[PDB]
Structure formats: structure tokens, C-alpha cells
């Protein structure tokens, strides 16, 4: 027993479910609580899929070195900085944002202004080109906290984009990055797959595409 | 409204419950299920603290900008690097420790050997000093993962001592950092509260080297 598989990072975060939710979408019979799977990898055998269930940041890993076929790049992924994968297909679907927030009714500090976040790569490159002498803090979580304590006074994260007052009780204070999610695929494993892989872009595109 | 407080660093992780132990037993009456508590900032005003759940890579941060006074530094942090705070008091209670370890009967890689592990700082530097031409690869999480489908045969990670078959279902391949959990204090903070936070360091220091 062993044959023609095709292994799918997904993005274990918020992104997952509406991650899983293209494919069924674009047709790929995934089965019921999938979406709330505990488990790291997960197979489809009826659909040809196997899927794990990385850690948001790694989906790229993963697809990078093929152990992934392909990725649903929730793109939290390629903020990371510039790799190798293709980045087939934006599925600006699995909506929201990057931004540099803080609470309420408090401004910036007038002394070390300073942010807390997950990103030092991108906040850094962000006040690095935006002129700010700021002052950087990475951190591995509870972001939410850093203000709240006073850590830093704005974090750099992200959050959904609707409107100004993010999930957090939090309030976006400068928009920096959009980011989608995209359907990565690893290249050596699509010289390979071609057929599932383009058969899956152009399936999830019209998914994507089509309602908008 | 304001005055005396003493904010505490915690690792949110495993240790919470040990370091909250560690007081309990060092005599902070903290409140019941304050070990399951979800906030991330939680007060006990009859015991003069304020208790910050960091993410356990973060405590020392906390620690080190004077958010937190002290932190019970789940070695963890010091992972990390060098860095900025007294390592007042390791409380060898919070045990386990830093591994290879990689899955059951399989051995390394004959070409490209390869670690996945949230930790490349010390996996890198262990083998940079080791003298193995590995391939070390920052995973953010789902460690026990990487091996399962090979991105890496070994993950260099945190797991359990006493034998050598981890949590996980992986087994310790060579072992590398023993590390304690520590008492940390904040140097600036000190300076301000050596009482409450030396009369916490001898308290904590009781529990800790007394029974053992």
C-alpha cells in the first residue's frame, strides 16, 4: 500500500476553518469536523488529500521543503520575508490584516516610543522605512498584554480590518500590511503534482474569483 | 487610589501551575484556580502582587522592561540568549529539560541530516559547537509534526528528563541543555523592592532548596 498523495499545509490559526472551507468549497469532500480537528495531519483518502495542520508561521516551511506539497499560505506565513514557493493564487477569501495598534485613548509614548509584537522583521523593516526611531519588542504571544502593562504602547499585529477597534479591545492605529492568504505550492512537488496542484489553483481560484 | 504592588512575571506554560506552587508553598496566598485562570494579568491584592501570564519565552522580556518586577524565568526564556536581568534564584522545583529527541527506531538522516525546533539560537549553536554539518530548520510549533512527516528526523526541543521516551511519543536522541526554571528580577525594579522581592527570593528559596 502506497501511491499518488498530496500532502496540504494548512494554517492551524483563525484562517483554518475558512481555509478548509475553500476546499469544500471548491469541492473537496473533507470530512465534517475537520474543521475542528485536533489532530496535526489529517487524511482525506476519498479526496487524495492528506493535510497537517501546521502551526500558521510554518505552513510555508512545510510546502518549502516539500514535506507539504502545498500550502494555504495564510500569509502571516510570508511575512516572515522572501522564500521560495510559488505563491499560486491569492484566495483573498481568508480575509484581515496587518496593523500597528494600541488602546483606546492613548497616544504614543513621547520618550522610547516602543512596540510589542510577534514581528520584529516586519515592524522593524515598517518604522525602519517609515523614519521612526521606535523601539522594538519581540514578543512570543499575548500581545494584548503589552499594552494593557504598558510594554510598549502599540503592538505590531495583526488583526481583522473592518473597522478601528480591533478583536482585542485593542484599536488599529497605522494600517501597514494587507495580507492575504495564498496557495502555495512547493516546485519541486508541482513539477511532480502539476495535475492535482493546477487542478486544485484552478479550482480554488474560480472558488475564490467567483463570489468574491 | 495607588501605591505598593509587586507584578510578577508567570509562564503561561506548562511550569504556571509549578511556579504557582512555588508561591503557594513559598506562602503568596493566591487565589484557588488562579492555575486555570485565562487572563492574562491577574491581581492578588492581599498579597501586596500582581501576577502577569506571559507566554513563557516572554516572562523574562516582561522582567527585563520593568512591566514586571519579577518573573519566574521557566528557563525557557534564557533559551533566548545573554541577557538583561538577575537570575536570583533557580528554583530546580519547575523540572525537565532540553533534548534531541526525534521518533522511536528511526535513526539520523544519512544525507542532510536535519532539526526542526522552535529554538535554531540553541539547536544551531549546539551543533555549530557539536561539529555536525546539520540543518536546522525554525518551526513556531506542532513540533512532534516534523519528524512525523519528515520535514526533520530530529527536533531539538524542550520535553521531560527522567526517561527517554518523551511526551510525545519521541525519544530523547542526545541531550543538550538541562534547564531550570529561575527566581528573575528586574535590576531597576530591585532597586525599588529588594524588600518584598528579596523577602520573595529567600521565601521562594526555602521552598525550593528545602524539601528538595
Same mark, same amino acid.
Request: with cysteine; hydrophobic share 40%.
Given at each position: 500500500?502506497?501511491? !499518488?498523495?498530496?500532502?496540504?499545509?494548512?494554517?492551524? /490559526?483563525?484562517?483554518?476553518?475558512?481555509?478548509? /472551507?475553500?476546499? #469544500?468549497?471548491?469541492?473537496? #469532500?473533507?470530512?465534517?469536523? +475537520?474543521?475542528?480537528?485536533? !489532530?496535526?495531519?489529517?487524511?482525506?483518502?476519498? $479526496?487524495?488529500? #492528506? +493535510?497537517?495542520?501546521?502551526?500558521?508561521?510554518?505552513?510555508?516551511?512545510?510546502?518549502? @521543503?516539500?514535506?507539504?506539497?502545498?500550502?494555504?499560505?495564510?500569509?502571516?506565513?510570508?511575512?516572515?520575508?522572501?522564500?521560495?514557493?510559488?505563491?499560486?493564487?491569492?484566495?483573498?477569501?481568508?480575509?484581515? @490584516?496587518?496593523?500597528?495598534?494600541?488602546?483606546?485613548?492613548?497616544?504614543?509614548?513621547?520618550?522610547?516610543?516602543?512596540?510589542?509584537? &510577534?514581528?520584529?522583521?516586519?515592524?522593524?523593516?515598517?518604522?525602519?522605512?517609515?523614519? $521612526?526611531?521606535?523601539?522594538?519588542?519581540?514578543?512570543?504571544?499575548?500581545? $494584548?498584554?503589552?499594552?494593557?502593562?504598558?510594554?510598549?504602547? #502599540?503592538?505590531?499585529?495583526?488583526?481583522?480590518?473592518?473597522?478601528?477597534? &480591533?478583536?482585542?479591545?485593542?484599536?488599529?492605529?497605522? @494600517?501597514?500590511?494587507?495580507?492575504?492568504?495564498?496557495?502555495?505550492?512547493?516546485?519541486?512537488?508541482?513539477?511532480? !503534482?502539476?495535475?492535482?496542484?493546477?487542478?486544485?489553483?484552478?479550482?480554488?481560484?474560480?472558488?475564490? $474569483? /467567483?463570489?468574491?
Amino acid at each position: 500500500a502506497m501511491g !499518488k498523495l498530496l500532502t496540504m499545509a494548512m494554517p492551524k /490559526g483563525r484562517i483554518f476553518e475558512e481555509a478548509a /472551507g475553500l476546499l #469544500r468549497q471548491a469541492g473537496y #469532500r473533507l470530512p465534517e469536523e +475537520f474543521e475542528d480537528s485536533r !489532530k496535526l495531519i489529517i487524511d482525506v483518502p476519498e $479526496e487524495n488529500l #492528506r +493535510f497537517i495542520l501546521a502551526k500558521p508561521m510554518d505552513v510555508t516551511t512545510y510546502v518549502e @521543503h516539500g514535506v507539504a506539497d502545498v500550502g494555504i499560505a495564510g500569509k502571516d506565513v510570508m511575512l516572515e520575508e522572501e522564500r521560495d514557493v510559488y505563491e499560486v493564487l491569492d484566495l483573498n477569501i481568508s480575509k484581515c @490584516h496587518l496593523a500597528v495598534a494600541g488602546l483606546p485613548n492613548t497616544d504614543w509614548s513621547g520618550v522610547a516610543p516602543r512596540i510589542a509584537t &510577534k514581528y520584529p522583521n516586519v515592524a522593524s523593516s515598517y518604522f525602519r522605512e517609515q523614519g $521612526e526611531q521606535v523601539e522594538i519588542i519581540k514578543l512570543n504571544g499575548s500581545i $494584548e498584554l503589552a499594552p494593557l502593562i504598558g510594554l510598549a504602547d #502599540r503592538i505590531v499585529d495583526i488583526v481583522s480590518t473592518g473597522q478601528t477597534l &480591533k478583536e482585542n479591545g485593542l484599536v488599529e492605529t497605522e @494600517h501597514i500590511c494587507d495580507i492575504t492568504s495564498r496557495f502555495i505550492v512547493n516546485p519541486v512537488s508541482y513539477r511532480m !503534482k502539476d495535475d492535482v496542484i493546477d487542478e486544485m489553483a484552478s479550482r480554488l481560484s474560480l472558488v475564490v $474569483e /467567483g463570489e468574491t
